[PDB]
Ligand binder design. Structure first.
Ligand SMILES: Cc1cc2nc3c(=O)[nH]c(=O)nc-3n(C[C@H](O)[C@H](O)[C@H](O)COP(=O)(O)O)c2cc1C
Ligand SMILES: Cc1cc(Nc2cc(F)c(C(F)(F)F)c(F)c2)n2nc(C(F)(F)F)nc2n1
Ligand SMILES: O=C(O)c1cc(=O)[nH]c(=O)[nH]1
Length: 375
């Protein structure tokens, strides 16, 4: 509604029409880096707060992983009106990823296909970006209480998947509110097989353990140990790909229950969309509108399978207050956006927060927490 947002969104639409996606993506990241994007300075509704365990979100919308892989634009992105962002996915060593162009959008179906292949500057460089973010944060009143999770993964050619995760934890864990374990990218060969249950249980317990050791091995009080938002050790979530068996899902559910994981991100992109014409050429995982139903059903299933015991972070095809309410009613406690920013632009968090609040009122819910899981 504001003019700053209005002008940027025209520009963004122009870019969407004329300019390659990855290039546009990076241009807006660079404009955020230089602090020339608009801010949402509005108080968020106390009735749409949410939490995962003791991690509290001032509103229920965050930016999904893969958006700001390297943490170069964290302040500007949160300042668009998001309560949190998941940076990464990061790996121990930097990787260039797959040959470009490797991201395409289909404006008509509001859908995206990418085969990025975990391109990122590497754990050490991103840790230094996140540290500078944490320092800015102590000085920047609009960043107070905003959450930064870190998605962490394996280098493509890795000796020890678990070892890669430990290396990332050891480096960046002190600066993270939460850690997301990503064994779900379509785009690194294998990796996805790391969703095998015995393997996954060991992954999850190795990660909680490396985090536990961060707490142990240093002498400072928590307030100085955790240079993050919570002042507590990061929670542990796992991100799940939606292309799985019911049996696979049930198995994963039991490993999540067995290991007392703090949450699950449902879901990553799908390789099962066949009917987007412009994508016929293409290899990779599809995001956006055409993922929404698959992702929502998957939320229902895992909530059920896990007996409502594991909080869900929703991802996939969320554009509108209605889409968000569906995620929440299926069982999600919090939502992440990606595609919506691409097609709808900079106003997305402002607009969707407003839409969800009105909806919550119309359906006669007292607050958002009351709606979670109401089938
Ligand atoms: C270009 C691109 C890169 C992505 N990179 C990652 C990543 O590094 N890690 C990750 O867990 N998910 C990644 N994703 C998946 C998103 O985090 C998200 O789950 C997916 O886009 C579904 O949300 P959407 O339908 O709102 O876009 C990426 C998606 C896109 C489109
Ligand atoms: C016009 C456009 C913009 C976009 N990225 C983008 C990147 C951004 F940083 C923002 C912002 F500023 F709000 F945080 C944004 F709204 C969109 N991508 N990203 C793609 C991608 F990644 F899918 F290729 N295509 C795009 N097209
Ligand atoms: O780097 C990527 O290719 C990528 C990672 C991921 O987790 N999901 C995705 O769709 N792409």
């Amino acid at each position: 509604y504001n003019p700053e947002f209005f002008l940027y969104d025209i520009f963004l639409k122009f870019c969407l029409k004329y300019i390659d996606g990855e290039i546009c993506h990076d241009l807006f990241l660079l404009l955020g880096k230089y602090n020339i994007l608009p801010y949402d300075t509005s108080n968020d509704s106390i009735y749409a707060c949410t939490n995962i365990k003791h991690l509290d979100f001032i509103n229920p919308f965050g930016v999904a992983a893969g958006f700001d892989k390297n943490g170069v634009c964290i302040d500007s992105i949160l300042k668009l009106g998001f309560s949190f962002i998941e940076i990464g996915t990061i790996t121990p060593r930097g990787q260039t990823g797959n040959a470009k162009p490797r991201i395409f959008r289909d404006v008509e179906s509001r859908s995206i296909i990418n085969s990025c292949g975990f391109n990122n500057m590497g754990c050490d460089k991103v840790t230094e970006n996140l540290i500078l973010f944490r320092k800015r944060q102590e000085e920047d009143k609009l960043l107070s209480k905003h959450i930064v999770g870190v998605s962490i993964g394996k280098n493509k050619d890795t000796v020890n998947i678990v070892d890669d995760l430990k290396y990332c934890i050891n480096k960046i864990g002190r600066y993270a509110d939460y850690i997301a374990i990503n064994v779900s990218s379509p785009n690194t060969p294998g990796l996805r097989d790391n969703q095998e249950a015995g393997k996954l249980k060991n992954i999850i317990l190795s990660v909680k353990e490396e985090i536990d050791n961060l707490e142990k091995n240093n002498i400072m009080n928590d307030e100085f140990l955790w240079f993050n938002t919570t002042k507590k050790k990061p929670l542990v979530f796992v991100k799940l790909a939606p292309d799985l068996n019911q049996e696979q899902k049930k198995e994963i559910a039991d490993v999540l229950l067995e290991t007392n994981i703090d949450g699950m991100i449902i879901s990553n992109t799908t390789t099962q969309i066949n009917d987007i014409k412009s994508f016929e050429n293409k290899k990779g995982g599809v995001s956006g509108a055409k993922l929404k139903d698959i992702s929502t059903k998957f939320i229902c299933e895992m909530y059920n399978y896990t007996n409502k015991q594991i909080p869900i972070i929703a991802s996939g095809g969320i554009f509108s207050g209605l889409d968000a309410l569906e995620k929440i009613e299926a069982g999600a406690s919090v939502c992440q956006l990606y595609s919506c920013l691409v097609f709808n632009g900079m106003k997305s968090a402002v607009q969707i927060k407003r839409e969800l609040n009105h909806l919550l009122y119309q359906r006669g819910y007292y607050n958002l927490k009351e709606a979670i899981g109401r089938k």
